[model samples]
Target: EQPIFTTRAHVFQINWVPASKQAVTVSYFYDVTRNSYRIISVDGAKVIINSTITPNMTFTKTSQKFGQWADSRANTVFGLGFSSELQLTKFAEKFQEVREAAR
Candidate 1:
């Protein structure tokens, strides 16, 4: 199944396309009360992928627009934290699986 991100306020999905020699790092403010997700400090990995999600999606200064929907709940919107560590791999198999699932 595809990954699901549901938020009471709003959500934004970011992509990191690193160079051959460099890695990617991202930090964000996660909201707890709103039951939202915050992607923070995603280290570089050999299999850095351009997710199946829309790459053009972004967050506004006031609201969030990550997935297909828009969240308008402000009071429930809170803040939190997160971290991720990725490994270096060709990702050929995983890529195929994700691609086929999207079809």
Candidate 2:
């Protein structure tokens, strides 16, 4: 699939324990077959977030440069730390727009 938007951010994950952080290129894309929006990020060969973004999913800001969302389907929460608040705001806005379209 071709990504519609892309951004760089430090990615985090929470499992049974908090994992180490890594900088990654995250992107928002429209899945042609599914008719939905998705966010995907990878660290080397490891696939981090491949979440099918739903209308109910909420992206919450935990700090000036950090934001996260819970992906129930993946059974985890993905957090992203941006270089600035401007990046965070842009990401959040795109998320809302995609969500609205998905619904």
Candidate 3:
């Protein structure tokens, strides 16, 4: 898998642990062979999040500048806050499109 798109965001934990964390970006992977698409957010060299998209997963928007989703693969959920709405929209649509592709 390779990164097809990228965006900057700060992590949110409205679902569970770690109230606040540093800022970083995540990339949307375009599955070439096995269709192993995922969004990976990192802090330095270590992995903070590795959310794999499945057919059953979904994304939700509560207000402007952010969107949230649950990924049981990691046993955690993610809420991404963007600097701008266009950035938020791009990722949202990509996620919606990819989950559709998962089938």
Candidate 4:
């Protein structure tokens, strides 16, 4: 499916023990047939963040240009480092909206 929203960020996996800044494309994917919402972050070949939005998921701001969200099932907490506070804000807000819509 095509992304409904797109953005850029450095992907991090908190639980995986990496402060590494791997720039990746983040996308908000929506499936009409299943009425599902998901957060998909991609690197060169590996799919890092393929989290499905659910009622239990959450997005948090740890810094002005950084934020993290712990997946309901995935052990690693996904952290995003944006270029600006506004960018982080935009992603965070939509995440909350998607979580609500996911229910």
* Residue pairs clashing, model 1: 30-79, 30-80, 31-78, 31-79, 46-88
By lDDT, the best candidate is 2
Residue 57 of model 1, lDDT score = 26
Q: What is the lDDT of residue 17 in candidate 4?
A: 54
Q: What range of 10 consecutive residues in model 3 has the weakest lDDT sum?
A: 14-23
Off by over 4 Å in 1: 1-50, 53-90
Predictions in order: lDDT:
0.26, 0.83, 0.78, 0.82
Q: Tens digit of lDDT per residue, candidate 3, span 4-103?
A: 7788887776435542376687887755686768887787777776788888899887667888898786777888878888988898899988888788
Task: List TM-scores for all candidates, in order.
Answer: 0.22, 0.88, 0.83, 0.85
Model 4 accuracy (lDDT, Cα)? 0.82
Model 1's C-alpha root-mean-square deviation from the true structure amounts to 14.5
* Global Cα RMSD, each model: 14.5, 2.3, 2.5, 2.3
Model 2, 10-60: lDDT tens digits are 878784332335567889988899999889887776777899989899989
Clashing pairs in 2: none
- Stretches of candidate 2 exceeding 4 Å from the true structure: 15-21
lDDT per residue as tens, model 4, 1-103:
5577888888888644543356678999986786888788766677888888888887889899999888757766888889989989999999988888877
Model 3 CA deviation exceeding 4 Å by range: 14-20, 31-34
